[PDB]
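Aim 2, interim progress: modelling of the zinc ion-bound target.
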Amino acid sequence: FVLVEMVDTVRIPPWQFERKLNDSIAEELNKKLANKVVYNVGLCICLFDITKLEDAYVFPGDGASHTKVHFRCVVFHPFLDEILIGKIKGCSPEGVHVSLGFFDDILIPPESLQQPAKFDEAEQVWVWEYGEEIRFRVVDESFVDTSPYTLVGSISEPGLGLLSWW
Amino acid sequence: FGQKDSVCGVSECIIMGIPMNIGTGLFKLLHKADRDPNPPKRP
Amino acid sequence: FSKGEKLPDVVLKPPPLFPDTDYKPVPLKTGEGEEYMLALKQELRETMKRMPYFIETPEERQDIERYSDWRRLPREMMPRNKCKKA
Amino acid sequence: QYKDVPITYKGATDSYIEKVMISSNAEDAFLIKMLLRQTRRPEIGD
Amino acid sequence: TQAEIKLCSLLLQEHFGEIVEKIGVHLIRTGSQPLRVIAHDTGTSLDQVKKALCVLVQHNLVSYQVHKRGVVEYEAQCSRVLRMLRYPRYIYTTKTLYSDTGELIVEELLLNGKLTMSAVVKKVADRLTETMEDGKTMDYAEVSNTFVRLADTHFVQRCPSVPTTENSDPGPPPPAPDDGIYWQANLDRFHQHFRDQAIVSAVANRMDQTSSEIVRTMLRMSEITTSSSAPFTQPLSSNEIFRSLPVGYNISKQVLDQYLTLLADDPLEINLHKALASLATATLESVVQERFGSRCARIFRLVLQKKHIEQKQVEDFAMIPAKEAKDMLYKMLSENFMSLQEIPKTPDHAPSRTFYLYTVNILSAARMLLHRCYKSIANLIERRQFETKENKRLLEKSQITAPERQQLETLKRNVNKLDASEIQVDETIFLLESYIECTMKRQ
Amino acid sequence: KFLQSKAETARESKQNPMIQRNSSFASSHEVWKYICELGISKVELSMEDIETILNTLIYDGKVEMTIIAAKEGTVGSVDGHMKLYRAVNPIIPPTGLVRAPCGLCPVFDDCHEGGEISPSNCIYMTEWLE
Amino acid sequence: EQFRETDVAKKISHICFGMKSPEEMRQQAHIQVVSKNLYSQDNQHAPLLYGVLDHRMGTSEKDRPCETCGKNLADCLGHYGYIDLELPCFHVGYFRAVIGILQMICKTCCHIMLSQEEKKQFLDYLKRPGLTYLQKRGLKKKISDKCRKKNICHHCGAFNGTVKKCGLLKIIHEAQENLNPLVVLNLFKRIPAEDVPLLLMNPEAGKPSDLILTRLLVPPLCIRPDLTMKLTEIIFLNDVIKKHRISGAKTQMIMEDWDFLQLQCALYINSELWTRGFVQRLKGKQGRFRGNLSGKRVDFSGRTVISPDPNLRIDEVAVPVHVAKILTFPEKVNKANINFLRKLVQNGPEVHPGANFIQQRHTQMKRFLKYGNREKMAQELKYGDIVERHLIDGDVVLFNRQPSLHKLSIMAHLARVKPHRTFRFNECVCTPYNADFDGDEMNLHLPQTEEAKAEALVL
Amino acid sequence: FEVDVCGQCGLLGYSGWCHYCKSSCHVSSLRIPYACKLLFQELQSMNIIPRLKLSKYN
Amino acid sequence: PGTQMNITLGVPRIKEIINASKAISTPIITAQLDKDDDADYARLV
DNA sequence: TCGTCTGATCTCGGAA
DNA sequence: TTCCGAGATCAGACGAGATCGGG
RNA sequence: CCCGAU
Ligand code: SF4
Ligand SMILES: [Mg+2]
Ligand SMILES: [Zn+2]
Ligand SMILES: [Zn+2]
Ligand SMILES: [Zn+2]
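Predicted structure of the complex, ligand included:
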């Protein structure tokens, strides 16, 4: 997890002029940047605070109010030094699929580095033996638009020993 | 010439379909709703 | 209509072509030096480095590079064998 | 193979047919000519 | 000359870096520009521009001089930057004319730009001893012997006196005892010497073997007494020709005297004006021979015979049919070799005129082919720029399946076919550029 | 008058004594033949079935003025009416060659970058590299 | 899973007028137009094949969609095609600048004939922080002053002269040299990028090599549903220049159809150096500038004959019923006109206080309120959505008497729906309009947005 | 009317992405009269190229 | 209002002023004198 | 339909 | 004698309300 | 393009 300072031009429609701005911008910005990975940034989640909100213009068209909003939002972005704890929501013969608990089932570990009893043989064998720990290793995101996924990870499992569970 | 013109006056803002800045488009309007640059949270 | 069929051709093939890799024998000498200095000009002091990579990296941590007989005798001769101008 | 091109009367108000003539032109091709009455009492504007 | 600037973007990108190219190539595009103005227009921070100009003044690509404002305007000479392309050829003729020691002398002089004697002899005492037998150490005194031996034939000239302006800083340019004085290489002496190989190969492959050697010994004894701006060589007598002959020859004086009046009277004509003027047309003729066959090359030599006598004789003077000939004229026209109809004098009429006559103009066909050859090496390097970044996975595996290795030997066949072919078009540049410099007054 | 003729059949026949060149030794001046070339033109060349057995110097010299443009000897003393010095010498090529595959293509000259004819993927360098 | 995507429109900051080099013309176009001099209409059912109307280019009719999009004629833009001219030819738009550059640059080395001082004197002028069009076009005079006085360069020393503009679109340089556009292309290739800003061509917009045309963009089909006929006349001549080169012909005709292509490329731009060109679509009181960008036709606007009515206040125009049932104002539904718009949408487009279109809250097509149940549309009417109610009394229309001579010829008026087909106003306000009632007509526009309704009423 | 241009190389690119520089990322819709769009597209037909440089609404 | 000896006074005068042409039709320079009391002295001027 | 401004060659005149 | 510069004398341009109505 | 309205 990491804070990301962001700047957005948030448009409040004119039937919300009863509510306070810093709340009613926050209700919009959650609908703008939740469950959405930003390229080279990470998976945005929610709104931390609005650090600076500047003055509400109203443009010659819409009649709405457009406030340029500086804020900070918490995002999900592993730092290439994190030993996370997830769950195996799937097993493919090329590599296991781990999922952080109801977070994102999009972390796909390749499996080449654990102890020399390694295969997934399509009958859902986890590992040939001697919560699940994970080492997130690389950042890898692909911008989708191409014509008229997207944070995938590669996840390792070294000689941790795993004293509690094998 | 590589003529970079800005779009001002009225003979271009009418062509481009921008509200001209001569007259009613000189100023601009704000809204007076409840807002403040607030304190953040302790991290 | 006589040409209204498709892009003239994907490519136009010239019936005569290039001769060879002309001057074949002796440019083995220059040709290795083409690749020799390019091995040494890139690995030189007279180059620049991507310090924009390090300002891009907020993941700085310890244990990574991001964190971390001439046998001769004295003499002195200064010759003006060269020009005395400019 | 037949697409009908119906000759409709646009107008704004109604019109009564008075005569309908049927003839051949020079290159004999069955010309048909209508004639539309309309009476207007002179109201505001005329 | 945009394709020329395409190469200077390519030549600095492969050698030093990218911002030293960018600040470099911008200076070629906007010229006499101060230090703050360059950093504002390229969008580069001022600390990196001071470093990038520091490397550029070291390799003598950017020259600085202030006139009026008290603010130094840097300026990059364009034609020096393309001489990096000839760099391994500058190494090789110091191996034919000097030993492996002096060949390494012009090498690290071309590499590190400005050098003092106290450094460059100290460096080759490292490189030549580490490749020779330990205990059989190469003595550095022979280096100092061959170091001046280069300078007496004036292959290495010294740097012009430094301006030492307040804006310029002395400490940054040297890379870290005695100070000494710096020099670059005299690559202008090479352009004589590369021309010396050019004329001696022009005679030997045309006239006879014994004709070319007396041209060589004429030019070998006229080296210091001329310059590149000499319209022709210094005049010599035939008696010192017999003195300056090599010891391999045994020819009597009177028979070579007959060959001396034979060699003086040719269509070729030592007239250094006519020599590069005749060698450039053969470079033109070897391009139409390369491209349009011997039949179109036959009419290409026909317009070099008669200046403005065309299309009423070219169907007759080569006997090739009117259909096959006139496509060769218009292909020589559309590719700008045939130049144009500069004789039409009837007023404003394409249909009714005094009949347009073709005429080759040697320089417009020269400057195009030089611009074409500048474009050519752009397509050479960019391919070698292309095939490099993919195959990096298997270069370090040696440091591997059967298609994995097979891609490498098809790469190394390709790159060595590209890099050898950068030099074979490079000899066309100098053969034509020296012709360009020979017809350019006030420069 | 002889438009129905292929002088490209006769260009080799006026070439092959100038390729052999017995006595390339430099014992003397080697002032070389143009009259014997007119002599070999009149009575008999290398063998060929020829309709124009009539021998005029005005119809036979023209094959030379094409072959000078095909790199063969210049005229020395043709100012005489029939017989003078007439020096000649077959010119061997004064250069090597100078081109490359990319010097051949006219349409491929257009490109300037990765575009529709970009040189990062041209067919011609792909053909040349095998 | 979802990756963030932004969906925001923007506005114009500036326009940088430039050219495209003929390598940029090719990779801004989707098809080659090397095809037939015929219209691509085939013999049976006249379809389109490769031609000059490929349909990846654009769309001329509602039924046929274009090919490079899926969209039909309605909401598809144009797409570009390009033709390759065999022999390069002069662009008649930039033709005065080609003589303007060939007078400045050397005709042998393609450098500008100046010293290193005068060059540095003018380049010091060009890096001024304030630069106007006046401070540009003033220099191009002065640099062409100092360069059309010299005869010897400083950079090559060769001899130049004058560039005299012989005849139609031809160049003569002092049996004098003629500069056809074949030799101009490589001369403009050898101008250094040092000397490009000195001809005042901002090289970010375009270098001088593209003042002449070796490729040519054809306009998209959606902006030509007679200029197509000038395009096929090019590709006819682009084959005649292609055939006669491999056919064998004397140069006085291959230099004539090159001349004929030079005019035909120029005739496609300007036609008064019969069929209008790209100049004549931007000219006079009919072109796009003076009549389609400024004086453009306007929806929600009517025109009748006027007759007096003193029984109105000075601020009111009597609008006929039949007009007021046609001209509609989109009044959005806003908690105060909900019962009022419900009351009037039951009337529909036959009784006058009524409506004839309803958009739903989300761009649903206007529901022509004639066919369906109006009461089912009345009850289902919610907040937010648009009702195009009739021109009712109390609405703001604005007059205009068509020879508008002063500010007072357009004036707003409140609108009261009367019973006739004349525009009736109070006769005190007739001298601003300069309007007598002798059969004079005057127009009535109806502003649609609520911001343009207040700008009529107040101002 | 409603048109799509791109930020860099600013030119009319149809729908979601601009054909010149296929990279699809900078393309941002404008709002313009159609007659002005027809001006740009017939200006660009001859060699005058109006290269729009957009800016966001401030 | 544009819609509404010899000197030009009409629209061809106002069109002549707005253009600011170098040479106009009927240019008139009036001049006051030092001694404006006698026709003979102003005769002499 | 001239009407306008522009800009392009000639020639009698002074300075070195 | 020279001539470099400048006032004099033709030739080409691209302009010339607005709308509305019908054949 | 004509005509006609103002
Ligand atoms: S490679 Fe690039 S340059 Fe060489 S031919 Fe193909 S396109 Fe022309
Ligand atoms: Mg009236
Ligand atoms: Zn489309
Ligand atoms: Zn010159
Ligand atoms: Zn784009």
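Chain G touches chain F at residues 21-23, 26-27 (CB under 8 Å). The first helix of chain G runs from residue 95 to 102.
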